[PDB]
Write a protein that binds this ligand. Structure first.
Ligand code: ZYF
Ligand code: FE
Length: 177
């Protein structure tokens, strides 16, 4: 039992796709330099720590996806599989049945130069609620003012206000591996 109110997912027509997506070049570690979405909330009192997401291409060309976060003095690892979708740069979630209440999952790479930065859009339906987020990925933990403002502009263009747009604080634990 619950009640909740969410900013609606934008139509997919407002979400560009990186042209000529190169899956081999997108591999490796990305830091989450910026975070936005309808279930993302700024918390000034206990700000979000930076985490990292590693993309490894398997032999079948799906990604093994591992996220690592520092929490409760430990490194927590989350693993999922991204299965190539309708066009290059889009993915759906492998083994969706193993996740209760999850009926829909989409990933679209919005833009990337592969060696410094990226913006990725995620949309899912979980317990019948439609969630979305955008990640600003960094090859390093810091990015230019220009790339952060572009990320803000894009997030706002999808209906998100500033208090749904977070810039996680760089840390050293867990994510420098
Ligand atoms: C626990 C707690 C705090 C936490 O540490 N969350 C992290 C875990 C580490 C990966 C980053 N991330 O998105 C988190 O949620 O999170 C939660 O209880 C719930 C419910 C949890 C349900 C399952 N879930 O949301 C997952 O994300 C499951 C596995 C994550 C690995 C997949 C690859 C991640 C790539 C995307 C990325 O780079 O961020 N999820 C969330 O709060 C966040 C906020 O919005 C979303 C979300 C929204 C739309 C689409 C995808 C989403 O993950 N998840
Ligand atoms: Fe999540």
């Amino acid at each position: 039992d619950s009640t909740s109110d969410l900013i609606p997912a934008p139509p997919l027509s407002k979400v560009p796709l990186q042209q000529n997506f190169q899956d081999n070049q997108f591999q490796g570690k990305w830091y989450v330099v910026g975070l936005a979405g309808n279930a993302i909330l700024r918390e000034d009192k206990d700000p979000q720590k930076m985490y990292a997401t590693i993309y490894e291409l398997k032999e079948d060309k799906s990604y093994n996806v591992t996220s690592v976060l520092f929490r409760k003095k430990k490194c927590d690892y989350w693993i999922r599989t991204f299965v190539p979708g309708s066009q290059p740069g889009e993915f759906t979630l492998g083994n969706i049945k193993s996740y209760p209440g999850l009926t829909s999952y989409l990933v679209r790479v919005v833009s990337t130069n592969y060696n410094q930065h990226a913006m990725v859009f995620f949309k899912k339906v979980s317990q019948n609620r439609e969630y979305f987020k955008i990640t600003l990925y960094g090859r390093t933990k810091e990015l230019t003012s220009e790339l952060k403002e572009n990320f803000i502009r894009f997030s706002k263009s999808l209906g998100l206000p500033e208090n749904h747009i977070v810039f996680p604080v760089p840390i050293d634990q867990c994510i420098d591996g």
